[PDB]
Design a protein around this ligand. Structure first.
Ligand SMILES: [Mg+2]
Length: 126
């Protein structure tokens, strides 16, 4: 397989769609409905691309990155933020250091595949 991907998004229809598109493209995908669940999943052991929704209720994408760092879970992942024109700022300066790219919603299937594949190469090399 082409590598492990985690889709973290509060929207079930996004998670399902991302799983479908990326499984057809050759990846293994796991899913999380919240920042809390993302942390839970990284604790089980995960290496690969994390597609992280910025706007989630309660704990947003930035809160999630802070939690990833607090738990020392950032090694062996590449975080791609799923954003929108409306996106909230990180309140802690420099969390952006841990984001390798952004993809703006709505996005097309080929953009998803292109970015996931590219940043998987980054994970596999480093
Ligand atoms: Mg959302």
């Amino acid at each position: 397989h082409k590598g492990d991907v985690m889709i973290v998004d509060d929207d079930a229809h996004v998670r399902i769609a991302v799983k479908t598109i990326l499984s057809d493209a050759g990846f293994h995908i796991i899913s999380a409905d919240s920042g809390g669940q993302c942390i839970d999943l990284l604790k089980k052991g995960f290496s690969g691309v994390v597609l992280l929704d910025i706007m989630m209720p309660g704990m947003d994408g930035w809160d999630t990155i802070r939690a990833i760092l607090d738990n020392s879970l950032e090694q062996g992942i590449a975080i791609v933020m799923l954003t929108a024109k409306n996106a909230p700022d990180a309140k802690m300066i420099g969390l952006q250091e841990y984001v390798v790219d952004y993809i703006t919603k709505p996005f097309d299937n080929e953009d998803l595949i292109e970015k996931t594949t590219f940043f998987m190469g980054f994970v596999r090399n480093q």
